[PDB]
């Protein structure tokens, strides 16, 4: 239902095995619901600012912008998900930054869903 909705909205799916992503979809959907409900039930505040501070909170940002809710969304990546795996995992992560096909690398590490969520949140955020 929540996961189902996410697929229709953001064309993104989360594997059954991942706990963190599964937990994030629950968290994200609930946060989107909470703030949307707050705005609807309260007198409309044109300014409400939601600051998402990690990749797994970013599911909420994806949904918020997609549901066309008026709350301003800031998404902050305290670390790049692909970056951690690519460093050490690859021989020369830093210099070949531009060269790397991110999609291929992300898929190869079975981390693709998490990457897609992080990238989606980045694109989604106004700032």
């Amino acid at each position: 239902r929540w996961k189902g909705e996410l697929w229709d909205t953001c064309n993104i799916g989360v594997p059954w095995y991942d706990r963190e992503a599964n937990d994030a979809v629950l968290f994200g959907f609930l946060t989107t619901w909470f703030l949307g409900e707050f705005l609807a039930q309260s007198e409309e505040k044109p300014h409400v600012v939601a600051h998402f501070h990690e990749w797994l909170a970013g599911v909420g940002l994806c949904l918020c912008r997609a549901r066309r809710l008026p709350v301003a969304t800031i998404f902050t990546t305290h670390a790049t998900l692909l970056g951690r795996y690519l460093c050490a995992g690859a021989v020369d992560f830093y210099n070949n930054l531009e060269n790397f096909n991110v999609d291929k690398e992300a898929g190869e590490r079975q981390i693709y869903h998490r990457y897609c969520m992080e990238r989606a949140a980045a694109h989604c955020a106004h700032v």
């Binding site: 059954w16 095995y17 991942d18 706990r19 937990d23 079975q110």
Partner: protein
Amino acid sequence: PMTDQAFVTLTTNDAYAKGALVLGSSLKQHRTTRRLVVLATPQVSDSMRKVLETVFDEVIMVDVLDSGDSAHLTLMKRPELGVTLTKLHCWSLTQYSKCVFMDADTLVLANIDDLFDREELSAAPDPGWPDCFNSGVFVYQPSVETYNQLLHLASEQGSFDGGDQGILNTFFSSWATTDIRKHLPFIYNLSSISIFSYLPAFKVFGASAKVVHFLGRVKPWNYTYDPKTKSVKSEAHDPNMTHPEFLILWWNIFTTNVLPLLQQFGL
């Protein structure tokens, strides 16, 4: 989010990895809030240990042959207890304040996060001697002290059954008499031999089963599953197959949520 608490399980080979994969999946299906930490011996292949790495949060590695291992000296005294000493490393997991250990030949049928309510060595009355605790499912609390005491007992007096159940029963003898809250309902660790040996009770209290424990020589992974018929290789009477759901629910979970993970990682 409950980073403090875990279900633990032990895989000593690839065979018992398939068991752990099913157990782990079943805990996920019934939506545990708690981390599933397996323990793998060196014997589990690299390819299998990536699958166990996907489903289970932390595949903490316990090897009792390495001379750096805490149990290695004990193993040299008791070379027959390798598996047991590996299992007892569950007590070393001091990153967790409380855990539920579950053997890899168990399967979860409903949410059992309420097991975490129970305190140290709360385990189901064992079928057979009902004064011993089936060490298949036991709430327990990690501790270096407890672990060292268990190793001491292993060296000094060993185990009556030469197994985890014996070493744990001797150390936690208090369970039998001290408190009834430490007794877990049999439905939390339902040995199938109970469904076979005493079918009438199962008929009445079986519906409420929360965990099934596949006992006997022929483990769930060993069976043959024809998905087209959805029917397991039917032997002559086998305790597991007294109930054609508990094992069917093992095989289905495997096929649905593991063969995919297995194929991806090359098994």
